[PDB]
Structures are given as C-alpha cells and as structure tokens.
C-alpha cells in the first residue's frame, strides 16, 4: 500500500496524475478511454526483433500504443 | 450461459464508478455463488466439477 502513497505527494505538482492513473487501472473510465492489455511475444512474434519495429505493427494495424515490456530470463 | 453488457445495479458504496462488465441476463441466487455445498440448481461440491474453461 505504501508503494502508491507516493502518488498523492506527486499530485501537488501534477493535478492530472490521479485521473490518468485510474484510467490505466480502469476505474474512472470515460467514453473516449483505453485499457491495459498483454500481448505475449510467442515464437510467431519473433518475426519482429526490436521494440521499435514492434511499435510499427501495433500502431499501424490496430491503433495500439505500448508502454513497456516484461521479460522472463533464465537465471 | 449467455452474457449481456450493462452497469451493475447494486453498488456497495455511494461514490462508485459505473462500468460495463458482462453482466448475467438473470440475476443469480445467493446459493449458487457458494461452491462448497451444491444447492438444488447445479449440485457441484468442488470447483473442478464445474469444468471451468480458461
């Protein structure tokens, strides 16, 4: 719970910060809004190698924008 | 069973955010929510007996 306590302290400088956080979470969903999804890069998706070229296919075909990536290395 | 998109009728608190959530067509009874004791509707004791896809 203490990890997102920082959210409220950041909200002083940034008024938007609370509203934009809840739109990502999918609580305060307005009509023109988005949501977080998870596209797993399988053996078929290795066709694309870089994150820059992944940005092309997602943006051009289905109008999606990526925030980041979640890796699972063997170690 | 089919699903219908709609805002959930009973919000447990006042200042709550309404959203479309794939609601059930029929409003289910309180007995069918429980797994442990299979009531006169779908007598299943454990969760594996339901046969959950995904």
């Amino acid at each position: 719970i203490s990890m997102l306590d920082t959210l409220l302290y950041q909200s002083f400088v940034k008024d938007y910060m609370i509203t934009i956080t809840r739109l990502l979470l999918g609580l305060d969903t307005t009509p023109g809004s988005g949501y977080l999804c998870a596209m797993k890069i399988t053996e078929d998706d290795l066709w694309i190698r870089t994150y820059g070229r992944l940005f092309q296919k997602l943006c051009s075909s289905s109008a999606e924008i990526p925030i980041g990536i979640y890796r699972t290395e063997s170690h | 069973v089919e699903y219908v998109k709609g805002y959930p009728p009973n919000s447990p608190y006042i200042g709550s955010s309404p959203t479309l959530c794939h609601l059930l067509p029929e409003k289910a009874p309180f007995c069918c929510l429980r797994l442990d004791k299979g009531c006169k509707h779908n007598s299943f004791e454990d969760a594996k007996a339901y046969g959950f896809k995904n």
Partner: peptide, 19 residues
C-alpha cells in the same frame, strides 16, 4: 445502450447519482 448510455453516466452530477 452503447452510445447514449456511456455519455449519460459521465455527465451525471453528484446530485443525480444520489437520486
């Protein structure tokens, strides 16, 4: 249902929610 239902809940004020 889709178009009319979404915009109605967004513009809905606090007094309209409580009613």
């Amino acid at each position: 249902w889709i178009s009319q239902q979404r915009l109605s809940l967004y513009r809905r004020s606090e007094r309209q929610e409580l009613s």
